[PDB]
Amino acid sequence: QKLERRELGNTGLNLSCVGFGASPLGNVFGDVSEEQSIATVIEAFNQGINFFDTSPYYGATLSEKVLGKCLKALGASRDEYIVATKCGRYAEGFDFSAERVTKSIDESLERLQLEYVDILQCHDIEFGSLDQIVNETIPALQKIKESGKTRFIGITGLPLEVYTYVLDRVPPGTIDVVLSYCHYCINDSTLEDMLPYFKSKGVGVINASPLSMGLHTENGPPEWHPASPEIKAACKAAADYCKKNGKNISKLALQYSLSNKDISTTLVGMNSVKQVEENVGAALELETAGKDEKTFAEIENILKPIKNQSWPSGI
């Protein structure tokens, strides 16, 4: 049994349905040795993950530098893996200007030790002027795409409204891919409402944060998590139900996110070999058994009062 791959919009790329979120390689969630990061990436690739996403923001450029060492250590042909990065969001703030993003791709390629990335996306555009994204940033990414330094272009951010605003205002066929987070998970499935829009526009869809930044974990969310107390309380109750019934809230949450085949990949952050095994195994078991619908029904009942509620982001 091999990990399923899915076509990404009109790009022709076939992505593993679980993708590697490389933010933890930048020490975002704790210190990880370079040896451990390399081992994790190698294990992911050996288990069939072919998609690796990063950003200059993660670890103030360290994630990109570490990921570049990991990709070299795969000892695989460049066309056997797919690399996405971002531009516009840095540890020193937001700059979506044409000059910044044009410089940024070269900085990213230097750190990643690559001649090109497959995907380059504007990072967290709800912090920028959406009119600048439309009229300046996206044209600059089109020029980067024309140069070959990226093969495809996209946009990311938390609020789904940013995607309709931007995609309504660029010519058909401009944007290749979007990355969305926190909106295709057990407490919030609003990304599904965007899928007809993205399909009409020929835009491939990447999801991320299937655990909603720690809500769907036995340990619960970090202290900084921006969700309301009511969201947190219901997610803790869902985790408690799973614990009581001998089930794994995080495995079920990932399986829920993976179940929609119109989403091409779900990024998961990984920094140990056992995390790779757990995440790939959840996907393989989902493929052959389908969703445990009795258990998902009970989770849905607990999360009902807060379903699809989000939190503020950006300007």
3-state secondary structure the chain: CCCCEEECCCCCCEEECEEEECHHHHCCCCCCCHHHHHHHHHHHHHCCCCEEECCCCCCCCHHHHHHHHHHHHHCCCHHHCEEEEEECEECCEECCCHHHHHHHHHHHHHHHCCCCEEEEEECCHHHCCHHHHHHHHHHHHHHHHHHCCEEEEEEEECCCHHHHHHHCCCCCCCCCEEEEECCCECCECCHHHHHHHHHHCCCEEEEECCCCCCCCCCCCCCCCCCCCHHHHHHHHHHHHHHHHCCCCHHHHHHHHHHCCCCCCEEEEECCCHHHHHHHHHHHHHHHHHCCCHHHHHHHHHHHHHHCCCCCCCCC
Q: What's this structure's resolution in Å? A: 1.4
Helix 273-289 / helix 249-258 crossing angle, nearest 10 deg:
60
Asked whether residue 292 is marked as a ligand-binding residue, the answer is no
**Cβ atoms 20, 63 nearer than 8 A:** no
Rounded to an integer, what is the distance from CA 3 to the centroid of its chain?
A: 18
Is the distance from CB of 258 to CB of 49 less than 8 angstroms? no
Closest CA to 190 of 306, 302, 85, 299: 306
Q: Tell me whether residue 165 is one of the annotated catalytic residues.
A: no
Identified catalytic residue from 58, 163, 181, 184: 58
Q: Quote the CA–CA distance of 258 and 256 in Å, as a whole number.
A: 6
213 is in an annotated binding site: yes
- Judge whether 270 is annotated as a binding position: no
Question: What is the C-alpha separation between 58 and 73, in angstroms, rounded?
Answer: 20
58 is in an annotated binding site: yes
Report residue 151: phi and psi, to 5°: -90, -30
The experimental technique behind this entry is X-ray
Find out whether 279 is annotated in a ligand binding site.
yes
Domain ranges of the chain: 1-307
